[PDB]
Amino acid sequence: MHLNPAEKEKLQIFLASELLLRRKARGLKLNYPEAVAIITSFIMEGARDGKTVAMLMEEGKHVLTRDDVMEGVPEMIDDIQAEATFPDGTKLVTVHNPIS
């Protein structure tokens, strides 16, 4: 596979998102690390799909809403940043106030 350091590390974000998604599917209100993971993996997978940075900057605000997460989680997350390989190489996606 030729994994480099980031590829190995970022695998764990996908895994944490999978975890958090199962917790959300069984009815739990998500916590801070869970919500961050879900939105982060959303971004990276969106970059793998070929969405643009501009698309993901806007889509990232609509992945989880305040009723998905515990009290105070929306206000804990000022933004979420993630880098992934888009069709045009590594780019950074910054999602401002992703959860309202």
Binding site: N4, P5, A6, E9, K10, Q12, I13, A16, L19, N31, Y32, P33, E34, V36, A37, T40, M70, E71, G72, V73, M76, I80, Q81, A82, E83, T90, L92
Partner: protein, 570 residues
């Protein structure tokens, strides 16, 4: 020109009278005073104030009052106060707390806090800064426990062990000259301050004392090695001669004595009573009455902090594993069971709140969680605010008095007890720069950056392959202070005076900063900052009811705590 307070705090962190919530607790700290000059606040960045000829002085060499490091706009939470200041570091030490910048053009610059060519900047505006936590109940069992402790803001580990050997898994002991030397050498690669305790057991002086001469920084008396009247006595005689602290886990079994026998063997000498509530060990059921005596420096370990609905159920198996007991032995089970009491755990909450138990500690990996000393201190203070109300001593909805009482339990008091508070334990000038920055939202849960001897050692930081350090995954990572030989200059190995005078560091090739253990034989409960209460603690032998001043000390277990499921992935 004027700035509204909301915008002021947003830009520079809070100032006098502003209050900050601690994590998701109901605890509020208030800025008591602020060393700044409004309008001359130091800040770093593109087009900011710490720039040559401006807030950075372009004239002075490093020796002429210039700092190695300026932490700008910190909200300090310490036993000494809760206030706003710049923190200036030089030679690895805190040299100035006040106002940094350039005397050329700024008012109020503390004279030795010049930002010059040699100055590195850390922005603390909006952060809470505390001393590094001092954990004096550490079992060295697994080297992976060090990052766990750094991540929850602990910067000094005092205790014993040689790894996952049964002696070490039960007791904070590194036994004898050779094990001690081996663990001093091991310590050269641990990115945290360390002090090692010898076995506090023996009926002759020499076997005990040679441990102190070999480099131990103190002694542990533990019932699993025989916490008899003789071992207690000989250990305190060694300690009084060597000027080191003795920690005790007394005879739970009451085999050779009851509590009053242990106190008689102690004979008024100073001693640190570990896990004073007694689930972690000690004369059953009344070991917690040690925390009323003037010569006792009382600490709790953390699995009973604070009292919750699951506390009791977890304790049986934990104890059995730690002390190598067998469920198929009834007296083993009886011993285990006698240690686990809702009555004393509930009163332990209140004793902390009243300043009768002075210190927290982990008991890492031997009935204690290496990364939860700071965490459970704040959970306890929060539960006490909720059940007992704001303390009488507070003024204006602030929890400052409780916050100072509780921050002292894991910073300055353990340091004082150990004889190392000249080096660490608090944010004061003259002391080693072990500093923890916290975002208020994560206060007490996950440390932002851990500074060790003036260099960041541990940080919550993101993708190393990214354009900037904030993209995911943000996780705790060792920083450059832990790398190569820098690990030597940023960490202290605390040793006895006799081992230092006998040239042990040179003998073993130790490159770490060597700290001297001293001034621990003439201290008492009265020296425990904000936690100096002596009183008659009555523990009923039949019902385990705890009384202080004629009143029963009881409170309920809680079902939920803050600083818990909002934060943790598991």
């Amino acid at each position: 020109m004027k700035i509204n307070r909301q915008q002021y705090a947003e830009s520079y962190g809070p100032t006098v009278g502003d209050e900050v919530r601690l994590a998701d607790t109901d605890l509020w700290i208030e800025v008591e005073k602020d060393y700044t000059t409004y309008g001359d606040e130091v800040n770093f960045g593109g087009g900011k104030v710490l720039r040559e000829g401006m807030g950075e002085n372009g004239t002075y060499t490093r020796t002429e009052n210039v700092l190695d490091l300026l932490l700008t706009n910190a909200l300090i939470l310490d036993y000494t106060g809760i206030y706003k200041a710049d923190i200036g570091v030089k030679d690895g030490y805190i040299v100035g707390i006040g106002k940094g910048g350039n005397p050329d053009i700024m008012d109020g610059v503390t004279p030795n806090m010049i930002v010059g060519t040699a100055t590195e900047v850390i922005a603390a505006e909006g952060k809470i800064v505390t001393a590094g936590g001092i954990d004096t109940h550490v079992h060295f069992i697994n080297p992976d426990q060090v990052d766990v402790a750094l991540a929850n803001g602990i910067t000094t580990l005092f205790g014993g062990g040689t790894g996952p050997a049964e002696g070490s898994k039960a007791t904070t002991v590194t036994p004898g000259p050779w094990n001690i030397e081996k663990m001093l050498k091991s310590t050269e690669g641990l990115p945290i301050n360390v002090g090692i305790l010898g076995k506090g057991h023996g009926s002759s002086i020499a076997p005990i004392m040679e441990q102190i001469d070999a480099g131990a920084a103190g002694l542990k008396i533990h019932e699993d090695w025989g916490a008899t009247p003789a071992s207690i006595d000989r250990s305190l005689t060694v300690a009084d001669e060597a000027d080191v602290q003795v920690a005790i886990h007394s005879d739970t079994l009451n085999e050779a004595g009851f509590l009053e026998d242990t106190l008689r063997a102690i004979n008024g000498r100073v001693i640190h009573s570990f896990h004073v509530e007694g689930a972690g060990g000690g004369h059953a059921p009344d070991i917690m009455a040690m925390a009323g005596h003037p010569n006792v420096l009382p600490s709790s370990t953390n699995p009973t902090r604070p009292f919750t609905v699951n506390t009791i159920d977890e304790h049986l198996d934990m104890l059995m594993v730690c002390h190598h007991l067998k469920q198929n032995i009834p007296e083993d089970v009886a011993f285990a069971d006698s240690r686990i009491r809702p009555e004393t755990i509930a009163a332990e909450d209140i004793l902390h709140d009243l300043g009768i138990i002075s210190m927290m500690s982990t008991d890492a990996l031997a009935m204690g969680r290496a990364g939860e000393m700071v965490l459970r201190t704040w959970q306890t203070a929060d539960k006490m605010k909720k059940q007992r109300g704001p303390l009488a001593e507070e003024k204006n909805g602030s929890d400052n008095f409780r916050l100072k009482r509780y921050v002292s339990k894991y910073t300055i008091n353990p340091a004082i007890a150990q004889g190392i508070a000249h080096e660490v334990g608090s944010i004061e000038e003259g002391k080693f720069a072990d500093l923890v920055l916290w975002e208020p939202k994560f206060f007490g849960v996950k440390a932002d950056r851990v500074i060790k001897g003036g260099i960041i050692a541990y940080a919550q930081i993101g993708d190393p392959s990214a354009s900037i350090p904030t993209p995911q995954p943000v996780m705790g990572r060792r920083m450059y202070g832990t790398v190569g030989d820098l690990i030597h200059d940023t960490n202290i190995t605390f040793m006895s005076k006799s081992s230092i005078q006998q040239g042990v560091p040179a003998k073993l090739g130790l490159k770490r900063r060597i700290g001297t253990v001293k001034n621990c034989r003439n201290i008492g409960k009265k020296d425990m900052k904000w936690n100096d209460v002596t009183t008659d603690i009555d523990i009923n032998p039949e019902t385990y009811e705890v009384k202080v001043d004629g009143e029963v000390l009881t409170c309920e277990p809680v079902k939920e705590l803050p600083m818990a499921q909002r934060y943790f992935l598991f």
